[PDB]
Design a protein that fits this description.
- With 623 residues, the protein is mainly beta.
- The chain is built from four helices and 51 strands.
- The chain has a domain at 136-516: Galactose oxidase/kelch, beta-propeller (Methylamine Dehydrogenase, Chain H, 7 Propeller), CATH 2.130.10.
- The strands form 13 sheets. It has a six-stranded antiparallel beta sheet, covered by helices on one side.
- A hairpin with a 2-residue loop joins β48 (579-582) and β49 (585-589).
- The longest helix is centred in the first third of the chain and has 9 residues, at 76-84.
- The N and C termini lie far apart (61 Å).
- Bound molecules: copper (II) ion.
- Copper (II) ion (CU) binds next to loops.
- It comes from Colletotrichum graminicola (strain M1.001 / M2 / FGSC 10212).
- Keywords: Metal-binding, Signal.
């Protein structure tokens, strides 16, 4: 049995005694001591000091740089007073065992985390966040598996499920194991399961991911460096693909105009040497090595050497089977699969590498690519505020790079999604790239508007999303930010007791952007796609669907479904549409070119002229 507090929980006379002493564990609350939080797990109190009002949350700490620590304070009340009497104090911590009052330092210059700890109590002056300007975050969704890699499951009438996976363990990784821990999350229902995927003899940690024409996910290399699994949404099963011609890890793959998948680099797993290109043909079910797809031009310069330098290429499938490589190498390049592969310089993005910077094609029709953040070395490297729009016209002809306004924060290991209005939301990352750390995690998301060419700071998330964190678009036009952490351990099935569990975030949180709210902070009225054919459509063809619940003519956009890991999302892409409406009936002529309309499963978003999007309808583009 479990004796709940007047919301704590032990597992009945010593219990009341134990819940007096802030040092007493041997306690069995929902989340354990150490757990990060979005909301007081316990019953909050209010408290005024002869002025103008603090909310207190017991058994919770605020971690981070303090403005002050004062040792002579025996009551939460006296701690409330030092905060009341200290300029720019939004957040203080009362230490129960030592009678000290910590004043937290100013946000967001400082990163402050809400952890669960019975030794402390948190005090704060309530924030007034207008979700019409800064969006709104929900509470931490706990998950059986750290979501180190994630992808939407293509489904009709719209997707409902987010698969994610880690390694052999739910919170740890080794080398070759032949098994992968997967999490299943229905976000239509909140249902959540995990499975163990051994049937393909594949530890899929550190892989290339690309969605095929038929919406199967192609999971390539990683801890088992030469091994390929294919996920069929149709079966919800995995299949063994043909081994790659060259074993790789931390590489990028991208689906091409013709539905072949190109990949290059991936020196993390297999031979510690740079990796030339290869291409998967799903019809022939065959990989073909591409020696002329030379790695050396796309090489970064890293203090750790070649191990790092060909990792996480900014690849895009483009016109007539071309590949654009936007980075993170200071120079951009065009890669092809013709003959034995090709490579040529396209432009210079910057004067330094941006390993694990963010990058998204926010307007395929206009050949437009947005890139921000990254660090010049993989780890132990200060991140950059620099950001660029890169415009690509014809393949194997120079590309145009315009530097734009610096981000508000330097971000290493951040993630990015394009939204239906074509704005790009950057989430997570840290001031200095340090693998397996919460250190200087930026909590404040930022929205970049390519039309304004201007940044805007969004509301803060709860948890630092650094290395092994992820971000992805959901059908409802919200963003899931999740994971971070994992522990290297020598052999498979070794104990994870020595691991720093504070860096692990086996969970996620969802952001509603500004566009989901009216000015009064109520949820704005989403257009509804009443009817759409589940029929696959081909490029150049005309999409017809029925929209109800809009004042004026809707705009529309297609956003290709997303796969994501290691600041790499090579499947997402925004294809803005021109619509013509006759009454409730909307009609769109899709582009002529599969280099813009990459084949696969898309989200159709109709959105109001004030910019409020529909829940999406699944749309399948075929060859
Ligand atoms: Cu990694």
């Amino acid at each position: 049995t479990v004796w709940e507090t007047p919301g704590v929980k032990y597992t009945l006379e010593c219990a009341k005694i134990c819940d007096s002493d802030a040092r007493c564990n041997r306690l069995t609350n929902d989340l354990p001591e150490g757990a990060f939080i979005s909301t007081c797990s316990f019953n909050e109190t209010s408290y005024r000091v002869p002025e103008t009002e603090y909310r207190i949350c017991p058994d919770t700490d605020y971690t981070g740089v303090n403005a002050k620590v004062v040792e002579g304070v025996t009551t939460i009340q006296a701690c409330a007073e030092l905060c009341s009497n200290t300029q720019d104090c939004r957040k203080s911590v009362f230490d129960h065992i030592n009678n000290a009052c910590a004043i937290k330092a100013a946000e967001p210059a400082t990163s402050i985390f809400w952890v669960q700890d019975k030794q402390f109590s948190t005090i704060r002056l309530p924030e007034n966040i207008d979700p019409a300007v800064k969006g709104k975050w929900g509470d931490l969704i706990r998950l059986p598996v750290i979501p180190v890699a994630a992808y939407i499951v293509p489904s009709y009438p719209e997707p409902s499920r987010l698969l994610f996976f880690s390694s052999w363990s739910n919170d740890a990784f080794s080398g070759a194991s032949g098994m992968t821990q997967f999490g299943d999350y229905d976000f239509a229902t909140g249902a959540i399961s995990q499975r163990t995927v051994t049937n393909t003899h594949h530890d899929m940690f550190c892989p290339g991911i690309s969605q095929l024409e038929d919406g199967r996910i192609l999971i390539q290399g990683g801890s088992d460096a030469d091994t390929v699994s294919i996920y069929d949404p149709a079966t919800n099963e995995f299949t063994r693909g043909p081994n790659m011609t060259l074993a790789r890890g931390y590489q990028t793959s991208c689906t091409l105009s013709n539905g072949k998948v190109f990949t290059i680099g991936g020196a993390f797993s297999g031979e510690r040497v740079g990796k030339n290109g290869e291409v998967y043909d799903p019809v022939a079910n065959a990989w073909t090595y591409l020696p002329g797809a030379d790695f050396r031009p796309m090489l970064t310069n890293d203090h750790e050497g070649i191990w790092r330098e060909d990792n996480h290429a900014w690849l895009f499938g483009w016109k007539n089977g071309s590949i654009f490589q936007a980075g993170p190498s200071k120079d951009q390049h065009w890669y092809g699969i013709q003959g034995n592969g090709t490579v040529a310089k396209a432009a210079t993005r910057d004067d330094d590498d941006a390993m694990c910077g963010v990058w998204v094609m926010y307007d395929a029709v206009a050949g437009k690519i947005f890139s921000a953040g990254g660090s010049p070395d993989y780890t132990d490297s200060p991140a950059t505020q620099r950001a660029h729009i890169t415009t690509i016209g014809e393949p194997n002809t120079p590309a145009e790079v315009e530097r734009v306004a610096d981000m508000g924060f330097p971000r290493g290991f951040a993630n990015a999604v394009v939204l239906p209005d074509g704005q790009v939301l950057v989430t997570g990352g840290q001031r200095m790239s340090l693998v397996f750390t919460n250190t200087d995690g930026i909590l404040v998301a930022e929205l970049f508007n390519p039309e304004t060419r201007e940044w805007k700071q969004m509301a803060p998330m709860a948890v630092p999303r650094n290395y092994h964190s992820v971000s992805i678009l959901l059908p409802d036009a919200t963003v899931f930010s999740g994971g971070g952490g994992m522990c290297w351990v020598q052999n498979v099935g070794d104990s994870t007791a020595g691991c720093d569990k504070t860096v692990d975030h086996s969970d996620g949180e969802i952001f509603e952007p500004p566009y989901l709210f009216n000015e009064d902070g109520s949820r704005a009225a989403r257009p509804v796609i009443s009817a759409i054919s589940a029929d696959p459509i081909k490029a150049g063809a005309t999409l017809t669907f029925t929209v109800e619940g809009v004042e004026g003519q809707g705009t529309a956009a297609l956003i290709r479904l997303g796969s994501v890991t290691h600041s790499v999302n090579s499947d997402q892409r925004r294809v803005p549409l021109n619509v013509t409406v006759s009454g409730n009936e909307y009609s769109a002529t899709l582009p002529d070119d599969y280099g813009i309309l990459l084949p696969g499963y898309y989200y159709l978003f109709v959105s109001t002229p004030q910019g409020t999007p529909s829940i999406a309808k699944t749309v399948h583009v075929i060859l």
